């Protein structure tokens, strides 16, 4: 059994596409969104009260 063989198979191993769990990216937090104002309504109303 040493006479050897022939590997005639043409390899076409295509790797599967890996799974991707997309992140819920957040650029500005809610604190920055509330702090991005020259005038805040809650502060004005509290001062008036």
């Amino acid at each position: 059994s040493s006479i050897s063989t022939v590997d005639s198979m043409i390899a076409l191993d295509i790797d599967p596409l890996e799974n991707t769990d997309f992140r819920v990216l957040e650029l500005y937090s809610q604190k920055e969104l509330r702090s991005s104002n020259v005038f805040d309504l809650e502060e004005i109303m509290r001062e008036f009260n």
């Binding site: 650029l27 500005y28 920055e32 969104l33 702090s35 991005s36």
Partner: protein
């Protein structure tokens, strides 16, 4: 009509480190003093 070897078959971009900065939106907060008199 003669067969011939007319079939010739022939067979990472930029890796790197990245740092992403966003445009700052926080309003500049400083301290203000208000002097006043109340006449009643």
């Amino acid at each position: 009509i003669r067969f011939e070897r007319n079939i010739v078959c022939t067979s990472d971009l930029d890796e790197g480190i990245m740092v992403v900065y966003k445009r700052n939106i926080v309003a500049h907060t400083f301290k203000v003093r208000v002097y006043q008199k109340v006449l009643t």
